[PDB]
Amino acid sequence: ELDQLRQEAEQLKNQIRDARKACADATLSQITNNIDPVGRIQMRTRRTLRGHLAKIYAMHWGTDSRLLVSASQDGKLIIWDSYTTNKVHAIPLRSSWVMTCAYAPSGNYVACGGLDNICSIYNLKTREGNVRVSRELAGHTGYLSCCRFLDDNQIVTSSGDTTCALWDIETGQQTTTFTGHTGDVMSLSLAPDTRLFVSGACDASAKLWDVREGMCRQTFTGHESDINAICFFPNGNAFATGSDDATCRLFDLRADQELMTYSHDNIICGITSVSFSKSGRLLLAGYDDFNCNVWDALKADRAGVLAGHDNRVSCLGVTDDGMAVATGSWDSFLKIWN
Amino acid sequence: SAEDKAAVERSKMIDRNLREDGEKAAREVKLLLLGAGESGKSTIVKQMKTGIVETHFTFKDLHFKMFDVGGQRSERKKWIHCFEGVTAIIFCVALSDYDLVLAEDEEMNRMHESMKLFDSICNNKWFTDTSIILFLNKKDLFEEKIKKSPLTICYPEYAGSNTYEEAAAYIQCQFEDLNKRKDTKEIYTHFTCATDTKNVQFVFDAVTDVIIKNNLKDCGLF
């Protein structure tokens, strides 16, 4: 019966909640009491990339920390050069409604997707020198919210159909499908070793997935509303989520709990993007206050602010080498902060 | 550098195509389409000519793009903000749904469900300024339906005859009362007309009015 399993199921949530208390020896705020603070993080707009004629929804650095991609509703996907601010490629999209971007770790491929329910993959290095679309991954039934390449052949995507998928670009079929989310999935982050990836969904939960098996390892709760951004700590043993509760929270995978919450009474708008620093001591979070905050990730004290945008900060990515932090926004401008 | 100088020639050749493409898109008119499943949006789309479906058509040298987003079946709260900046929101309601009920719910009328969707759209924080064209479809079937069934089944309070003219008029005004932004957005309501091919002409006149009234605002002459 429904009741037998439900009265059973609510018990299984207890042992999980019971054990998490037993492993709550002391709060990170208590352990990190004697760390010297980070100091004022004064970060200035070095470069400003112009040429989008609509709001920007996604951007992603390259593994070389110099080139980057950005999409907007203008139906243009532009590959920028951050050093010289000059446009390398401007890819026309079939669908103006794009919500995500990814630049392949090899830099040969770039991928974008949105309300068209398709993840289109564009080939950059092409004998005839004109970025051409290689494959169109059509197996989702809701808007694609995020996508991150594993190799030049594996891409994992998260959609509004409450499911994530791992694809095989050559065959164009979902090698694995991750189901378990009870709400619309908003963002995913791959681990440094590319063996696990955590996803955040509208059901105020984040789930740690296994890319090979295709089953969810752990599920983290604690937010109160939608989770809009997620990123791992550089060491892959922690991650942070940005929600509409205007709080960012740092979860651990080993301890399976929540460590910090980055809330300030003054902040009441929702976090749109989060990202870490190369060392993981700074957690940069892009709010809807039209500005972007920089948090001390072990003290939870808002040390520094990057306010330069007219409209909301949609996307916020840091480079692999950590020399720079770039924020997009609905004001149609990408700004490189250093 | 000789290579870098040529690099900047691309970036300028890119930017001159992005401006030309941006100025081509600015001339296009962006209408969002909404409504219930059985609204008649299908019949409207036929007269004008998975995922988010686009329809392109031209009338009197103006280009229209209609975004039929009925097929998303996900939470509107996360992707409706994509459509801020449409010229107008076409909204289709079927007049012959006053006496029915949704196939899923018990006794919540289809017409009352249409209002719940209309309340959330006209007062959505993303469309504070956006005008709403409100098509009321299947008007002829509503005439036959009202001549036999009462309108009290849907609206409990109603003083008025079962006549087409008065029955309809109450609904139109009942839909028009949902907006709190009374003097910010204008709801242009039309009864769907088959042979005259006026449904497209009403869209034309309603869109120009939204453009002409907007033009009067930014130039301060209003």
């Epitope: 830099g107 005839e128 | 550098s1 290579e3 690099a7 020639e9 300028k12 050749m13």
Partner: single-chain antibody
Framework: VQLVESGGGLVQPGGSRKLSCSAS????????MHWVRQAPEKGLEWVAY????????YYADTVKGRFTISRDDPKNTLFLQMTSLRSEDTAMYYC??????????????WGQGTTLTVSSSDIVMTQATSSVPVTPGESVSISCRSS???????????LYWFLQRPGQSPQLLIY???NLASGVPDRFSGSGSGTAFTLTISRLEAEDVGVYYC?????????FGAGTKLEL
Amino acid sequence: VQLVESGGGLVQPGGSRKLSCSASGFAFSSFGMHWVRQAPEKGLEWVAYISSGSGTIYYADTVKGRFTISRDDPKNTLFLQMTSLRSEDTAMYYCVRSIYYYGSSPFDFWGQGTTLTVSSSDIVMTQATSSVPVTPGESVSISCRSSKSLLHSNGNTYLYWFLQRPGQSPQLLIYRMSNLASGVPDRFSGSGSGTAFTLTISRLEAEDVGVYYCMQHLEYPLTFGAGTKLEL
């Protein structure tokens, strides 16, 4: 992705002839094109260049104001208008394509060129090796010297390499030092700094025997080097 050029043949001196190169199989409208001529017995020599969309047109010292170069993007053709040919314009006129953006490979594809026989502050690249004997399966190094520091401020040493097999068009091997072109085996490698450059082949074959060239791209007019023929 083939490039073919038309014209050439036999022309009396002082005559004006036109060379047309019909691009086919690639995005011709977004490629900066060149012309490079090779004398019947001598090495390569740059002559002209057009940027993308005819925005920038350059010329060599010997052909300045004598040659007119034009492109017809809709028809995917490239034109060269030659005026008052001299006896020193006898050369095979290759047509080269090149695209300039961060990380691109200019001078990657070379046309078959046309034969033209007329009746009758500049960087200098120097390589003093010619007809070097070599055996298949050995390791050979080809050295190049410049008269100017090609290492630009950003760290790009704009030195290129080419390989011309006997009776074939030149083929790019290395588009900048410590870089490897597309479709060329891993055996070719190049390491150098400032004015000293080397090209190292680990193990070769009968396929890669021929003459090698060195080109700089730091500034126009893209002076080439003399040949370096591998003897076998």
